UniProtKB/Swiss-Prot annotation, chain B:
Name assigned to this protein: Female germline-specific tumor suppressor gld-1
Record note on what altering Y8F does: Moderate decrease in monomer stability
Entry's free-text remark on domains: The KH domain and the Qua2 region are involved in RNA binding.
Gene designation: gld-1
Task performed by this protein: RNA-binding protein which recognizes the 5'-UACUCAU-3' RNA consensus sequence. Binds sequences in both the 5'coding and the 3'-UTR region of rme-2 mRNA. Binds sequences in the 3'-UTR region of cye-1 mRNA. Binds to cyb-2.1, cyb-2.2 and cyb-3 mRNA. Binds sequences in the 3'-UTR region of tra-2 mRNA. Binds to the 3' UTR of Notch receptor homolog glp-1, thereby repressing glp-1 translation in the embryo. Binding to the glp-1 3' UTR is inhibited by pos-1 binding to an overlapping binding site in the glp-1 3' UTR. Germ line-specific tumor suppressor essential for oogenesis.
Complete-protein stretch covered: 144 to 195 of 463
Length: 46, 54
């Protein structure tokens, strides 16, 4: 999986923002993104 | 990690197709989606063929 860095986190959060403009049109993608954001946040501080 | 089934794989593939409407706009997501598709294909394959590991 991708290296954890604040830059990556920022991309993930920005891409997540954009998709919320289309309610539940990319439901699977949203779960993946949320999972990966959570994973990267934890990695950043450990 | 989501359960591996045919319907899920199907949803993944449809979502990937939709994302092509947005070239170069969601590339972090493209990598994640391709990873999850691969993982799911492998999971369905390992379930048909339990004695094969990849």
């Amino acid at each position: 999986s991708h290296e954890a860095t604040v830059e990556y986190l920022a991309d993930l959060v920005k891409e997540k923002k954009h998709l919320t403009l289309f309610p539940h049109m990319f439901s699977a993608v949203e779960r993946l993104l949320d999972d990966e954001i959570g994973r990267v946040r934890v990695a950043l501080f450990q």
